[PDB]
Amino acid sequence: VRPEIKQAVTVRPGMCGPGSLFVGQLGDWTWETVSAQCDTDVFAARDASGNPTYLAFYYFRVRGGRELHPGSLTFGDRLTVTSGCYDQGTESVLTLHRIDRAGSDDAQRPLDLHEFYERPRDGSLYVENFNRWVTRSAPGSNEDLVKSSPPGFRNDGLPQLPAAYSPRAVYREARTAHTFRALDEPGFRLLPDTVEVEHPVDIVRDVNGVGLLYFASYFSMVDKAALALWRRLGRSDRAFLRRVVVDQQMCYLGNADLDSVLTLGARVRVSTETPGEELVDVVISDRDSGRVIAVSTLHTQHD
């Protein structure tokens, strides 16, 4: 058994705010955690062949609550972070992070699958990162990525996930339904208002260090769709900045060439039980290749 990684974190400018910095930090922590627990340098990974292999983001969840959500975090906040990986075979790995306020009751507690999957606590942030090793099929192409595994990836002795907690069932349902919250879920009503935004890939902002669309830029693009729909509903920019995201799920179905024009579609369901509570679904399409490259659902509270 490789130990879980606990760290004390003082919130820095580069990991908070209304943008994608927090997600970017979470992803860096996933690569550090897999590197420590799977005896592999994820940052410099190469397949047996010698080609770079990327531990690509595939399913990403951030679950908080009114007591602690990503927008709670300001400069200098003291957090505790507990991280660990779970066996998903040789081509994929699940990494969990729990984030608590430092000196909160039982912040030293270890990872608990039952807590993450069945009894999440309002006041902790729960992060699930399901990642898949991929290589490019052609240099300079971001399409048709190929499954891989770096030589010496040690998934053996990683703790096991029970069948109930499978991220594969979760993301399979999202690719089919274009939501992580089934449309027949009681207590919601679909608004007739939707948006469809043409988004050229932003080569200034959203390209990563290996020439793919940057995983955190998917969260920026989803929020661009969400803001477009917020504005179409006649709500204020000021109010968008006060929006509380208590849960968000993202599936990365594909990457995209850097000259692509993407389409960002957004729809919303409002709670009939709780004022201000709504489910926003965003689908990112690459019309020219015929592909859905992302699905995201946000569970929000606003005023």
Added chain:
Amino acid sequence: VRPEIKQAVTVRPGMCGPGSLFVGQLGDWTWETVSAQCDTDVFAARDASGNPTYLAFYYFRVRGGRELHPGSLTFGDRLTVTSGCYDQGTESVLTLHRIDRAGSDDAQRPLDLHEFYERPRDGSLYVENFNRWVTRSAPGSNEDLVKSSPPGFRNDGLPQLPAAYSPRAVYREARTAHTFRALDEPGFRLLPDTVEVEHPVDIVRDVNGVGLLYFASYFSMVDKAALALWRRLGRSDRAFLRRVVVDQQMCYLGNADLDSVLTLGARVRVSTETPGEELVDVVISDRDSGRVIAVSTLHTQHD
């Protein structure tokens, strides 16, 4: 004398690529370095009064070269980083970072002002961050920030900068000239082509954790201006991604309210001595308040 901070850094997704992630990481390292050397928690700083005080970016330089520039950095690269602060009084502080490739000849060498200011080496990256303590003059206003100093800020015993190496002369000339490279510099020719881009503040991307425009977003906005001018010159997006920035200087003259519409102006001078070498100047204006809020010069090499 507080020791300089040396660290071994493996390049992570969250600190490289064609965007502003590297600058964002540099800034976080500046706050960590000042915190260690000035016995102050910069992240959670408060003035005597109890109001949050921010160690705001004011003058920022990144100098590399063909052998090592920010676009050299890819996932898993091994670097050494050496960092230290220099006395600029109680209201400001200068932080330097040198970045070398790990196992490069004499990467263990300490900071050397003469090297940074007079004999920079092609193959090292030199970072200068001149930062000023500020508070808001009114809650929810990003204009008319006020000079501050947190109680217990220890600038005493920080090493001294000689008069020759003053960042104040450098940024004073840039606010006046709207360039860091004097217009009468021999060996360049101003192109007639310029751009002026209207840029509404991007509330999805560019807001920091304390509701200011995020310092790294200034580099994104400058590159948005630079790309607009690149396109007006009929150059390809592909070629913009291959652009080498061997030197860049930024002055943060002001911040801006989150409903502002900024103006990004860009002009370029081409080398008459070296094909592909050009100086791009970007000025960021807040027309509605009558303020120049940023100036940047980039020294570039392209193909």
